[PDB]
C-alpha cells in the first residue's frame, strides 16, 4: 500500500499587534490554511 508522506501539517504564522505602548491584544494569522483544520 502507498503512504503519502505528507509533511506534518506545516504552515507559516503571523501575529497582528498594535504597539505595546497602546494595548496588549494580538491577532494570529495562519496563511494558506483553512481554519476548519486548526
Amino acid at each position: 500500500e502507498i503512504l503519502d508522506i505528507t509533511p506534518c501539517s506545516f504552515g507559516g504564522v503571523s501575529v497582528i499587534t498594535p504597539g505595546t505602548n497602546t494595548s496588549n491584544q494580538v491577532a494570529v494569522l495562519y496563511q494558506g490554511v483553512n481554519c476548519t483544520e486548526v
Binding site: 509533511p7 506534518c8 506545516f10 507559516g12
Partner: protein, 49 residues
Amino acid sequence: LPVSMTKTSVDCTMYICGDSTECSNLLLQYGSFCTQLKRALTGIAVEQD
C-alpha cells in the same frame, strides 16, 4: 510596463533542515543568517506593495 513582481517568503529552518530538531540545533550555531534573509524578503514584499 511591469509594476510589481511576486511576493515570496522563506522559512529558513524548514528549508534548510525540514523537520529535524537537532539539525535546527546545529543551525543555532550559525547565528542570524535566517533573520537577515527574512528581513530582505519582507522588505522586498513591502516594496512591491
